[PDB]
Write a protein that binds this ligand. Sequence first.
Ligand SMILES: Nc1nc2c(ncn2[C@@H]2O[C@H](COP(=O)(O)OP(=O)(O)CP(=O)(O)O)[C@@H](O)[C@H]2O)c(=O)[nH]1
Ligand SMILES: Nc1nc2c(ncn2[C@@H]2O[C@H](COP(=O)(O)OP(=O)(O)CP(=O)(O)O)[C@@H](O)[C@H]2O)c(=O)[nH]1
Ligand SMILES: [Mg+2]
Ligand SMILES: [Mg+2]
Lengths: 734, 747
Amino acid sequence: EDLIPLVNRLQDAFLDLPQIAVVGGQSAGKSSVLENFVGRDFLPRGSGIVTRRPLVLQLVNATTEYAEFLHCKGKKFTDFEEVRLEIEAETDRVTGTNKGISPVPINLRVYSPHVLNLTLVDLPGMTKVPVGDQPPDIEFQIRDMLMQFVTKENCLILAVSPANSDLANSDALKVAKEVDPQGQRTIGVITKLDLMDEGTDARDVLENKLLPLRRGYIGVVNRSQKDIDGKKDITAALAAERKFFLSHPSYRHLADRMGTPYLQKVLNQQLTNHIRDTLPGLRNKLQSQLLSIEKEVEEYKNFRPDDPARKTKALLQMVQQFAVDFEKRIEGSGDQIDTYELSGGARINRIFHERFPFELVKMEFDEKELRREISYAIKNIHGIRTGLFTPDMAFETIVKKQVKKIREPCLKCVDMVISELISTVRQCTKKLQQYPRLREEMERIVTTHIREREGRTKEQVMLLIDIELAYMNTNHEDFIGFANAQQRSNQMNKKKTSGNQDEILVIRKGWLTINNIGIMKGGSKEYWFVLTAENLSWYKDDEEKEKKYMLSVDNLKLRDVEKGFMSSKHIFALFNTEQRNVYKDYRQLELACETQEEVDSWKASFLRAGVYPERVGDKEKASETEENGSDSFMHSMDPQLERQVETIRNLVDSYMAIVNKTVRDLMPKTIMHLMINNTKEFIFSELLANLYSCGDQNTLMEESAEQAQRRDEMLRMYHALKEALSIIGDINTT
Amino acid sequence: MGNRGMEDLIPLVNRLQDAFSAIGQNADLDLPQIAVVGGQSAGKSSVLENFVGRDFLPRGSGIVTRRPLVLQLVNATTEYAEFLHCKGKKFTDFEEVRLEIEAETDRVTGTNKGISPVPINLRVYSPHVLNLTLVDLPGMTKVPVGDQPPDIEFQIRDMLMQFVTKENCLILAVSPANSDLANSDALKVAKEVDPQGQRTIGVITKLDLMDEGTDARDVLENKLLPLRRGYIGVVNRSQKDIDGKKDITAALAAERKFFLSHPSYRHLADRMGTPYLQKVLNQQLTNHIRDTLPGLRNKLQSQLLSIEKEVEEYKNFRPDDPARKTKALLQMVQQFAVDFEKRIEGSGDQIDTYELSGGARINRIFHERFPFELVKMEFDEKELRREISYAIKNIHGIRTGLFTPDMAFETIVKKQVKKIREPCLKCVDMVISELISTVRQCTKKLQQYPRLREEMERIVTTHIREREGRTKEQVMLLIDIELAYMNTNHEDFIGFANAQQRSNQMNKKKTSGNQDEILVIRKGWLTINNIGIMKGGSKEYWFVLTAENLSWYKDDEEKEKKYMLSVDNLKLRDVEKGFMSSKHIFALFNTEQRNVYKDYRQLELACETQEEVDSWKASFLRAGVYPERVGDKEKASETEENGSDSFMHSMDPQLERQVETIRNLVDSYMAIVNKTVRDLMPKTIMHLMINNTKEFIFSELLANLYSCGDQNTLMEESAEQAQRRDEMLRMYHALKEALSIIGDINT
Ligand SMILES: Nc1nc2c(ncn2[C@@H]2O[C@H](COP(=O)(O)OP(=O)(O)CP(=O)(O)O)[C@@H](O)[C@H]2O)c(=O)[nH]1
Ligand SMILES: Nc1nc2c(ncn2[C@@H]2O[C@H](COP(=O)(O)OP(=O)(O)CP(=O)(O)O)[C@@H](O)[C@H]2O)c(=O)[nH]1
Ligand SMILES: [Mg+2]
Ligand SMILES: [Mg+2]
């Protein structure tokens, strides 16, 4: 009984035992041998054909003893007389009540406290002549059906033969020699030793002399039919058996190797000899799984709760791993980074450092109200005093109103970073700290620290944008005033006199749509014209390398398109009266404007360049009797603010550009200095000492009852593994 | 000890046996042999000796019977035992038999549990036994033990099958009661060799050693495995009883008290036990006898039915009365007479098909083989012409005659027809010689009686030899008459009928004397050289030249009738230069007229050799075709059907024409006298030699056989037929006695 505790400890910490097959002729006593090897009386036994269907018994180990089937599901038979009745009922259900057979195995599974995980196979007897309603080929049918079970390797064969008939008539011996010629896996059993004729004995058979078998024969005595009808229990049967073997004159010296107990001993011996050569791997596996627990149960081994040393050591190392994990998840130190999400709080936070600019773009880019209000500013800072020059206090007043609305996105950003940071800590305390009252208080302290620092960061952001409403410098990379638009070719490139083709063409560049285009050029397109008070060029792209032809400015005219055309999009044509120099009028050389102010702006650019106005009476003063005091002009079309409005608007857009980029670049730094790094150094150099201050500190870091039961079950598995290794050592000692 | 049923069955079966044997036929009772089968240590030999009743077979634990035993019980007066390999020694104590038989068994097979298929023959002679054969056989096993070869069960099963697979073998399927019935190997064998269960007796042994709490009632009530003959349970001596040497009376007493005291077998105690088994086997033997009797009975009926046909003539027999002798005369004479009628006259029945002869065929062939040696034997030509000439110039030898004289014809035909004397006599002798052989052939089947073949043959042969002289005289006189008168008013042609001779006997008939033509005078092959399309090509045709016309044929069937070509008013020339005529070619033409006819440039006829050319030119000159003289161009008027071939060159007396006339008349008269003799001589010998012999053989023969004596010494044995008679008589009486014995047994 060393494999018994081996197996039960394999069950407590949670073998390929060779199955057992009993073979023999009809009425040899196979089922009695089998159930005496199990230990309990539950198999059909009687005269004539009884076991007419293969039975596959799977003994396994458990804490209580009962039986179950694979067709009577759920029901756990606890009395075995019901098991026997169920067996015979199922057998009569399939095979019928006329001595038929069937190769369809019956599957049992019997649970018992001290058994092996075997597979005992009871098989029908071997018959010669078919009786009842059996088909005429019944011998081959039964023999094939049991050869389908025996010819496998690692199948022990109990060859059961009665002692009434001679040994040379046995069928089990023929089967055993046909499938096992060497006898590596054959145990010979001789039953019915009490019915032999008066004057004979099986002495020459039990001494392994008549037919030599490698492992010899075991003589057993079961219960007779009157003993089965008389309900003779197992104890009295074994007592009578031993009485017989100690009383019989021809067997009195072989009494210590005959009987049922010796048969059970020999089968245990065979099984134990078969499981060794598996002990190396079987031991190595559970040794390897014991290494994974021995590192842990050094701490569970001895307490004795309410000890200061263990609790303080736990506080220290838990705080250590929490701090390490926090700096690891924010700054992203190695190793073993997460590759399924972005991060805990690193990338999700840097995405808000560079999605905040999308919050600055959504607002506002408005409106015509801007133009109207800067006009009112120009008028009001000229309240009673009038005229030149363009005052700059209007600029300082407008840009202090357009950046004033930047307080809203900036503050928003902080809140996002807060809702995203206060979550990262919750992500690194929901899985590390299983101690109750230690994860919640840890979260409380850290989150209060973050809530305290968000106030400082908000005050700093308020101060930051309040600074940009103080000075409003103009020495930055924006252009100096009176430089609209793109003045002046980098200070005229240090040359303006001899340069006929030295960028004297560049004064006002802009897109203008041509309606009529000839066949050789292409189709309708909006070209990039470079207008000068003296010349004009046209480009198709930005490389500034077209320079095909130079279009004039002087002595040129302008007219409108015919009625009915969709001028919105106002299109104006150029012409000449004396000469045909337009040049290359496409019937007609027309240019389109997209808005309404653009038409007047380009008309004024032409009027300052030297182009005559679009008056209806100007045609009679086409190129003869010109400049008659400019009776058509009223001095002027738009005095004198539309140009001032445009100049202030350009200056404001440039200053907004640079202030947007500076807030966009500077606020991430200012929440990284006052919130992130300060939280980090707090979580490093203050979390422990501040954590030692709150609570009664006695009932801090307790169970956590799940941890308690987790500890108990790991400790019991540790003891189970040590016991199993001790048993394997004992079983290799032999 | 028994047995008693056998002592009561032996007398009637012994009487039946010696009745079936003393009747001499290959008839036997063939009592079935008893073969006992089973597995090892099923209790077989005990059952066998319980059937016999004497203790002489080995038995015990383990393997005992290792060689088959063929026990032949033989009925005799002196009881003893003998072996085949111990000839000359008689055993009286059976203990000696058992000891020496186990000595033999372990002497041949060894002492290490070996077997051998060589049986041990044993004969027990006793006044209380039948002539049975009891075959004790080893029990079959499955695994070889000791020194047995690995195929022990196969060779044991062959040892059994060479004994149980023969027909009419009782099989005692012995099975123990300890084992289940479905493990009985004896029943497997019985189902393999006897599927209907006609001859299988099921026996159950070792009933007293069954497991406590069970019983074999479901088996013995013939309920578990249904067997046609049923089961019988026996209880034998145990191993301790044999070691205790228990006698038979106590064993049977224990058997009976066991079957009576058992609570499950008390109502079967009459059909259980060893005596009941003994009774059942004896009943099986008796059933076999009474079941095989009807076949032998109707077989003896069918056999005696054949002998009765001949016994009916042999019902009364009282040697040696003249009644049987006179009946034998009438039988043999009448058989011989109808046989002689069968051989010649060709009356029924059962004419000889295998032999072409026969007397009628040989004989009436020699009637039409004789006319072959009338034409063949005698012959003369080209010399009788001279004799006719001298007769013409001698019978009117003083004065010349102005007529053709007749004595010349008479003397020539008289000199020639007397040459027929020899063939007729030879034919008569040859017919005698073959008929006298037929009469000896038709008395070889008469050899059942000696000294009667000789008398029959002597009488008949002397009769033929007494008649041969008479018929030779008659034939001589018949051919002699033909020389007397020599009439010329017969159907032959009268003188001066053919002029010119002869037109081939007037076209060989009288109907075609006008329809046919005279184109046939000289037949021969002749080659035509130039031939048109319609006639054929260069070819040699068959010309038939006539003194009047010319015919040409391409075959012999004579159905063309193409054209009749002229002879008179014709010419002849030879070919132009350059040709080698050897092989000479001749052309026919005319100068006055252009009648050729149909010249194919040109009409040429070719001949092969030199005699052919000159012979056909001679035929042209004899017919009247103009010669090839130098005046060939001037043949206009000076020729007038030339040829200079009237009778002969140049002048001889008129004896040629008269000799030709005499020759024609002589040949015609010889033809008609040959018709007369060929048709009349066979009639002569059928009337004087055969029909008279037949009348003698049907009428006067019996009186001549009966006249000579003695009547007793004339007919006798020939002891072979007498022995046949006695054998038939023994068969008759023996078969009736056998029918009587069977009739006695049936009731
Ligand atoms: N007297 C006696 N009987 C025994 C002994 N051993 C077994 N038996 C009897 O033999 C009978 C058959 O036993 P069992 O094991 O059921 O045979 P089985 O092999 O199951 C028949 P199958 O399997 O072919 O259906 C039983 O009635 C049993 O009592 C014995 O030692 N002594
Ligand atoms: N108690 C008892 N023993 C029997 C009975 N029948 C046979 N035996 C015992 O069986 C033993 C051998 O029996 P036997 O008849 O010789 O079997 P066998 O077939 O001849 C052995 P072999 O194969 O050599 O022929 C003997 O000891 C005999 O006493 C029986 O009815 N009752
Ligand atoms: Mg069973
Ligand atoms: Mg024997």
